[PDB]
Amino acid sequence: HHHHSSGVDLGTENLYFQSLQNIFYDFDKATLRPESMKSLDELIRILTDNPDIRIELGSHADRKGPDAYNLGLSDRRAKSVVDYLTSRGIAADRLTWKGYGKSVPKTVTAKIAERHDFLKEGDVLTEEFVAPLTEEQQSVCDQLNRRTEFRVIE
Ligand code: NA
């Protein structure tokens, strides 16, 4: 099969790539911002250039509001991405998705840590981590949790 031990995955959770970005959302919205459409066009290029690969997506919500509500919101966030891709010709069978609600806070990557003096690589944006922060710091963290993650798979 593969003639080597596992290498680095092309995904948004562990590493930062200019050409494979997280999708971020407004508070209580599943809408694709103009920036999100550019990011999805970059993903469509990867899908069309590599016709056999699939994309696994995971959609999320920030700590505010009930668990069940946030699960539904995360499903709508995944669906908006799937609908944009399928509207551009991507076969639905090439995409898998899961809505995690607010159950999986994001881990701060080296790029996120470079951009914010208060965040360090490896910090997990849990409710307990975000709770004692300033209103501005909470807004940065909550925004980072309102995202869709991607991973390129077979
Ligand atoms: Na930092």
Numbering used by the authors: -19 to -1, 534 to 668
The authors write:
Several studies have demonstrated that P. gingivalis employs the Type IX secretion system (T9SS) to translocate gingipains across the outer membrane (OM). Furthermore, sequence analysis revealed that PorE is a lipoprotein anchored in the OM through N-terminal acylation, and is composed of four domains, from N to C-terminal: a tetratricopeptide repeats domain, a five bladed β-propeller domain, a predicted carboxypeptidase regulatory domain-like fold, and an OmpA_C-like domain. In the same study, it was shown that PorE is essential for T9SS function. The C-terminal domain was predicted to be a peptidoglycan binding protein, suggesting that PorE could connect the OM and the peptidoglycan mesh.
The crystal structure of the OmpA_C-like putative peptidoglycan-binding domain was solved in complex with a part of the naturally-occurring peptidoglycan peptide stem, bound to each monomer of the tetrameric arrangement in the asymmetric unit. The structure of the PorE OmpA_C-like domain was solved by single-wavelength anomalous diffraction (SAD) at 1.55 Å resolution using selenomethionine containing protein. The four molecules present in the asymmetric unit form a tightly packed tetramer that is predicted to be stable in solution by the PDBe PISA server (calculated buried area: 11560 Å2). However, this oligomerization state results from a crystallization artefact as Size-Exclusion Chromatography Multi-Angle Light Scattering (SEC-MALS) analysis indicated that the protein in solution is monomeric with a molecular weight of 17.7 kDa. The structure of the OmpA_C-like domain of PorE (residues 534 to 668) consists of a three-stranded β-sheet (β1-3) and five α-helices (α1–5) with connectivity α1β1α2β2α3α4α5β3. In the PorE OmpA-like domain structure, the first β strand is missing and is fortunately replaced by extra residues encoded in the expression vector. This PG fragment interacts strongly with the protein, principally through the DAP residue, as it remained bound after the whole purification and crystallization process. Indeed, the DAP residue is deeply embedded into the cavity; the carboxylate is engaged in a bidentate salt bridge with the guanidinium NH1 and NH2 of Arg591, and forms hydrogen bonds to the main-chain amide protons of Asp542 and Asp576. The NBW of DAP is hydrogen bonded to the main-chain amide proton and the OD1 of Asp576, to the main-chain amide proton of Lys 578, and to the OD1 of Asn584.
